[PDB]
Subunit: 306 residues, 6 copies
């Protein structure tokens, strides 16, 4: 049977990330909205077809889940696990609801955000609002190509969607968000050769540096994990730059979907806390996490039925 949310969206060039908390007594207003969210996507999005590609993914946090539903909980659902590393600190910030809104135009995102928060004023409190845009040729603020090794098609369905291991909630996924702020001054002080040492790929051509040469504290080194299974462990990311030139804010908004947060959380450990042969991900010497939240993004039919 079950239809999931538009987690596997195509490439989109605009996004709004909205994270909010439920005030006391808001729970009823929110449950009403969750049943209608699908129909607002269509109201706003239908008229702009087919260029629009407007998609909203709604996610719910661990404490918010217990306030909203009783019954079963998704297996992997918990608050974000703060990581207090030797050097770098992955923080945990409040967040009950996520709207990850994507389209080919910002206005569509904004229109949907308007209608959603319109129904929710009274009942929630905004914690974070980010307007994200694609930079050139799928590049991020650091000037590297961002998204290349994401899984596609069949391999994406397999790495992202809950299946038979938690059959109650098949079609759902686990999203982790974290807002990063970069130290561009520092970063642009590096030679390109040295930047490529940090990331693990070539800047201009976006080719992976060979085993012969790729540092073990490079980002691509530390985020490549193999299972016990011997097969690679993959997640799906849709990192979006944001910023303001006035307030020297240059950002990467990280969002990572996985069929189980164990995967996402492992990559994070390796980045913040280190391996045997690496102190921490070099990327963090130019990037500070200022948020961190985890959510479960149910199947679409789950929300329909409220």
């Amino acid at each position: 049977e079950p239809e999931p949310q538009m987690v596997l969206s195509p490439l989109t060039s605009a996004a709004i990330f909205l994270v909010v908390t439920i005030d006391s007594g808001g729970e009823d207003t929110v449950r009403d909205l969750l049943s209608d969210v699908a129909s607002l996507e269509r109201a706003v999005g239908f008229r702009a077809q087919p260029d629009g590609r407007l998609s909203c993914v709604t996610g719910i946090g661990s404490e918010a889940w217990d306030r909203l539903f009783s019954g079963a909980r998704p297996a992997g659902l918990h608050p974000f696990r703060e990581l207090d590393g030797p050097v770098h600190r992955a923080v945990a910030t409040p967040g009950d609801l996520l709207f990850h809104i994507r389209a080919s135009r910002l206005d569509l995102c904004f229109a949907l955000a308007t209608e959603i928060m319109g129904r929710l004023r009274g009942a929630v409190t905004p914690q974070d609002e980010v307007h994200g845009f694609k930079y050139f040729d799928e590049r991020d603020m650091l000037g590297f190509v961002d998204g290349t090794e994401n899984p596609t098609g069949a391999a994406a369905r397999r790495a992202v969607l809950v299946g038979a291991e938690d059959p109650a909630f098949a079609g759902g996924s686990y999203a982790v968000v974290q807002k990063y702020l970069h130290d561009i001054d520092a970063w642009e002080g590096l030679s390109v050769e040295a930047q490529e040492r940090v990331i693990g790929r070539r800047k201009m051509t976006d080719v992976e540096l060979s085993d012969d040469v790729k540092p073990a504290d490079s980002h691509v080194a530390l985020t490549s994990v193999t299972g016990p299974d011997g097969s690679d462990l993959e997640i799906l990311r849709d990192n979006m730059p944001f910023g303001s030139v006035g307030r020297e804010e240059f950002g990467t908004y990280f969002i990572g979907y996985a069929r189980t947060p164990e995967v996402t959380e492992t990559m994070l450990e390796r980045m913040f806390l280190g391996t045997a042969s690496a102190p921490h991900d070099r990327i963090l010497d130019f990037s500070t996490a200022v948020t961190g939240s985890l959510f479960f993004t149910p199947a679409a039919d789950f929300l329909e039925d409220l």
Copy 2:
């Protein structure tokens, strides 16, 4: 004598950047103005011909006197505060304006980054607004915005300084105002009422006929005719912006004209009223929180320092 890209094509994205010049920044600023033309190309060229990146640089009255000596543009002065019976148009600080436009936001942002990069230390940001086209050229009130702007030769004649101030021919006078709307209240009106506020039909964007159109409608108060009986026109490129988190919904107003007298007449009519109208009804749902006037020189004036 070639002008700045004041007559840009339709673009879907913009950054408005307004700064003041710190004491001793005058030198760093003069350097940037000479190079601004060439940064436009650097950033923009590789995205052609979709890109449509354009930057227009404008200079305030007080800043002009700090940066150059010699003759001044005839019309250049600080934005005039309007203390109306009900509505007040404020004046906010602003030495430099960058009006950056393109078909993608990232192009605007990359140019804004490179400009503010050369000015970090010399200036202090007063205002930064990221604007976007809503839908089918609608604004935050739901009406089509731009329809009666002049085009081609009529725009050339309405926006560019000519023989009347020959020293500065190719320049223009930009007025900016950030407006915030009380959407709460606006969506409280029927559509028929909203049309009476604006002066056009919402969905079809046809003018209301002169026999039904109120004298306090926005379109009424912003149609001015001269002594010679011909229309007095400006060029606008209003951009919506906002934040749903802080229930901020806005229209960023920018209006270019060959003399500020024109732009300023429309404003007086809006804030202070006519015989037959207390004030523009659009202000009962829109608050001005900025106001600055700039002169946007011919391009050769900037190149040559």
Copy 3:
């Protein structure tokens, strides 16, 4: 599955509706054309790909079915039922074949229509020919967004395609057509608030009116029907405006596909005859039906092989 005809087309912006009757002796010429119709679709369409999105769906009436084939009939196939209501009359007009031709450009529709009518010169008599065009924001002639609540993906497959319940004809569907003409003068006499009360959605933003404000005689009210389960019964529509400014004709050409006509026919009863709560669909006070025909659109396999 069997491969079905292109009933699930994307959004296309142009269409030709061609309805014909079969003359005496034309049976043979028609059978030949049905076998080749698939391959004419490709001839005409292939060189314009993928911008083109040319699709033709062919359907066959009740009486024509018996002239053309022997063997089983589709379970639901019958003449359109005239509905003689208190006020409004849904009429039944003759039609043996339907060609529902759709593309992103009118000329492609016209080239294929030319080739089809070219092979049927002698054999048939045209009853109806409409050239339709989508308004630029998916609006119809009344000014409302038209198609918003159509099913997509798996839900559409389930709503429109014959399955196991008549396994002989799996992949087929049941198309109902009606040409409507509108009294625009009257319609533009209403406030927008009133027009929204007729339709049941907001004009500009295309959001459903809330359950507590939506009239029982609104179009959206009378066309939402619930099944045995209490789950919604859906059809797939691709209404197209048409008209002529010279002869003050402004129209909406209605076409609805469903896996069984009982569904489409229920919606019609509710619209024309009324419920306890509602005299008739208020949309009919501004729209007159001047045609009405029912067709079965077979699986594509069924045409290929005879």
Copy 4:
């Protein structure tokens, strides 16, 4: 230079030609519409920028000019001159006003036509209404590329716009329209080689046949006219196919702009009456003119001031 109407439109893929006559007493209503016509173009067309390319060219006939205006007449303006040839007849049909409406989508045309006829209902009577569409590679109904040898840029400005030779009306132009209906059955009976002989260019590649192979009764031969000047005389054409497959109507709607009708009228004489070396244009053996009108399309400034 004074501002002209949008005669020099880019390539556009849709059009509506509307021809009407002014009933008596209607002259006031028509003067009103002419002043506002410019601003209706923008009302409808603004919101669709920049894809829209909506443009309306308004033209006025000889008799209607005298009923409508104040003072002096455009030099070249007169009723269309019937041409009673040995074989073929170029007929003259009634027509006081022309709206030549063009865009990249048919709906935009229709919207503007609606708004225009809205202001005129009562005051005029429709004579002819054609909905035209380009084939996908600039082909006409005969299957040949159509538009190739039109002038561009400076050469077009010079060959179309009235200048100092009639300085009251500089910026205007002279349009000739004629609706043609083709005999497709006949035409498709020819070999391609023979079709090429009729037109004077190659069907597939659209290359001009070499000087010693191109018949003198070919269309391209008879419509190439040299001045006293020794230089070529040029017009600007935007021929649009139209038709109905039901009613076996296949058409080409001819519209031709020139700075003086002398040029257009010369091509017509050559076509219908013959030269020294040719009876008549072979294309007319497959094409019947069923209308014919001439109009003057003033400068835009002229219309604004009424």
Copy 5:
């Protein structure tokens, strides 16, 4: 189980065909490249999305297969069979690897070909390099629409991909290539009506000639085969024109994918050797084959190891 290579690519307008042989001792350098070829496709292609539509399909010859791997062989894999017909000769030329590289722009093909040949310098020897371009309305060098009756969606999956009949290599396909050169002078000597008799469809409208009037020596006649069960036998083609104006070379590069080569090879026998009804395909009277090679294009997983 398996993800296949991008054999079912969308319509693309540019291609590079690259055919090489493996030098002695190159086996190792080649094996490394095959494991990484997937990830080079993404490197080069990702930043061009979604316009780019860059795809590479890699295939391996019969003799090369035995050099590179031990273990099972694909059931159908063998050297291209020469066909010495009464009149026309289908030749067999050397070729160990195939890269069938496709995109919307030529430069993307070229950047990937650069990266591939970069890792293979020293290990291989180029046999053939062709830069192809589709004409703007899907026509080929003879002026006819080329691709029309290719299978799509599920029917293509069924016609092209190895399934349960050799489950070891499911997801694979069999590619046959032939470079053809045309005698354009001769071809353009025909009336269109005659050309249609060679091909079996209408030139301009691309409609099949009716069964009664279509010659049995037309190209479409000889390449329609039915199986024993009476359902039609299909392949997937992506013919690309190429040439050089300077050296009067005008060509069609033929590539055909099928779930077994028996199918492709049958069509060839009919073309070169004839049926009862037909001496040979008339298209060969204007087209000469100057290459001929057969490859197995494995499932993508098989390369990743």
Copy 6:
């Protein structure tokens, strides 16, 4: 004005450069072709509008000019000047005619080249044929953005077109071509910082290096010349990469247009021979010229009239 050839073309992604010499007795066949070349451009190109952007610019060498025409010669027309530098050599190769064919798709270039070489079979001998392609972000074979500082609009008119100084040939221009091959192995051996020192701009962001830090042997340094007039001397370039991976050929085809060749030739002297402060342009340490030819590209009117 007179109309010039399409020297000021928009951005195009594909090109064919064809250079030929005229055989004994070819002069007549060539004169015929030149009169028709404008009209072949339109034949081939018109049906592909507006995406096509097909343009062909035809140029004629010094010795060829005297075979083909008598009467005046263009002031600046002469054989390409060999420059035998201390280190690097700018060579002269033969060329009577140049066809500089540009469009958005290669096939359009090829179709026009085919039609042209078709009419010249027998009469000419090909000296060079190059199929060029722009990389997707306007980069060239060295990885840098190429075209940035080319003049546009009115400043280009002023830099490229012969005017009043040789009024007989106003509308013409002077094209110089050179085929370059690069030693990519060597080039990719540099750090990016070093490559930027060769070119004079930033690789990634395409920003000029500041006057304080830009080497005097950088390419941008040596090719900025100022006139007697005090203002900069500009040319118009449309460099195109080409190559073959089989024969390890990676190339840049150089073409430069100017209103007089003295401008183009000065830049070349500076590149190959050096200044006081520079031995030679560093770009030549990675690029070898293997052709060199100079042509005059006449006004379009000049060709039409033969």
